[PDB]
Ligand binder design. Structure first.
Ligand SMILES: Nc1ncnc2c1ncn2[C@@H]1O[C@H](CSCC[C@H](N)C(=O)O)[C@@H](O)[C@H]1O
Ligand code: NA
Lengths: 265, 265
């Protein structure tokens, strides 16, 4: 009679919380999805071994179209868990799944875990200074979406930082690198000429947040655009005006050029 | 030889990640602070028992003025851990502490935990739609903070949601309630009269996130300003222009007046 939305955390099988692990171990059925994101520092097998339960993986369609026919029925007479990378309900359409549960007479509870939304705090950029967030999508055919460029513009204009999620093809396991995101943004700049993203723009790249050895790099596009940030996923941040303390952290921890102490503060 | 920045989570000791617990269990010395937030469902003893270590609790002064005199010296010969509520670097000033560690020749690592910043997802509000965040601070003497009011205005103008962290005076065991935040905001409105926060403003209250039964309420100020939301900690959220599904969730899950289902696009 109960559905548990449990977050898996950031990177590996140890990123789930003690609460989430203990609750999962007591559920009769355990489902999971890796279409919104993947756990790059681990495998389904390692997650399964840790929880000690077989984990039925669900596709985006299984969830979006048939959550009520695959997951909820079992929740009527058993304890069911639905695992997702990061923190549950962060992915835009997941909150609605709780409404579906209610409509089915199923009680649901949320077990939180670290999310990239809070984990970026490791970049040294103040959390309150982040503005609207965006996702960089690949242009395709006759479609060249550029809204993510306008997000940066509106944020930076108000001295706010912009968190950018990079395109991902979960099933194809194809990632967009921070390098590719930068090239795309430079191409968007050439079209819009807004003076929003150029070779002189300061950016921060966060890779493998959650790992004990994440990659945190900060610098100007012209120097970072061809740098190797390692294995994904990559997160790109275009920070607005910098607090002197933010800049000092970026210099001392993220190897940023001391130039930002005078140029971006 | 190393220093560990380990977050403890939202509500109780089980909100720590498995990674955090295993590492904390093996540290030689364990320090912590409980002034940046409130973990309403646990006690120092319960945490000590889980980790199996004695925990030396530090005050704001011990940390801000003496971190490098109390904690760092031990990290030069042992593995030290510094625990904090929620995520260690979120809406705190602990990030700067990594610079202090570096300057003292001490390597530091960060272990994330669920944070209130991402837990807002449980309100049904799309997390990418949140704008600049703010903090409602208790007035003191003749000083009456009001910057948080302008944050709302700026976000609302952009159709973005506003997350408001609430004040805490841990040494006095004072935790600002969503009710007190609403009272303060109405007073600022009387002063500025910008039509930013009034009796007709829709707000969302999230209390004790991380517990199994957090209080999640949505409604007009006039109706919620005196509602009992349970024990602290609380956060107040002033949503912008709602998506249809956001409104549906607020009504179905947060008990908002069904009339907000009708969005003025
Ligand atoms: N579990 C919780 N439920 C509701 N509000 C919370 C909360 N935890 C923190 N808050 C809010 O956040 C404020 C502290 S700011 C520190 C946040 C912490 N570092 C984190 O990552 O979560 C509290 O005063 C309250 O306003
Ligand atoms: Na945000």
């Amino acid at each position: 009679m109960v559905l548990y939305f449990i977050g898996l955390g950031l990177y590996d099988e140890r990123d789930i919380t003690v609460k989430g692990l203990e609750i999962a171990k007591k559920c009769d059925y355990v489902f999971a999805e890796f279409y919104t994101s993947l756990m790059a520092g681990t495998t389904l097998g390692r997650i399964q071994k840790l929880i000690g339960k077989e984990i039925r993986v669900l596709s985006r369609e299984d969830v979006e179209l048939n959550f009520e026919n695959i997951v909820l029925p079992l929740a009527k007479e058993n304890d069911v868990a639905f695992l997702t990378p990061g923190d549950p309900l962060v992915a835009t359409t997941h909150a609605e799944l709780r409404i579906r549960a209610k409509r089915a007479g199923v009680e649901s509870y949320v077990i939180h875990a670290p999310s990239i939304y809070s984990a970026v705090g490791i970049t040294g950029l103040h959390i309150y200074k982040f503005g609207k967030s965006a996702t960089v999508a690949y242009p395709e055919g006759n479609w060249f979406p550029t809204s993510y460029y306008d997000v940066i513009k509106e944020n930076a204009e108000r001295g706010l930082h912009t968190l950018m999620f990079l395109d991902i093809k979960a099933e194809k396991r194809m990632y967009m690198t921070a390098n590719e995101a930068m090239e795309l943004l430079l191409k968007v700049e050439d079209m819009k000429k807004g003076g929003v993203f150029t070779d002189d723009t300061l950016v921060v790249v966060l890779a493998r947040a959650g790992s004990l050895n994440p990659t945190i790099r900060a610098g100007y596009v012209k120097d970072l655009i061809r740098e190797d940030f390692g294995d994904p996923p990559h997160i790109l941040i275009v920070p607005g005006k910098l607090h002197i303390v933010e800049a000092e952290y970026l210099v001392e921890i993220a190897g940023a050029p001391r130039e930002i102490l005078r140029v971006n503060v």
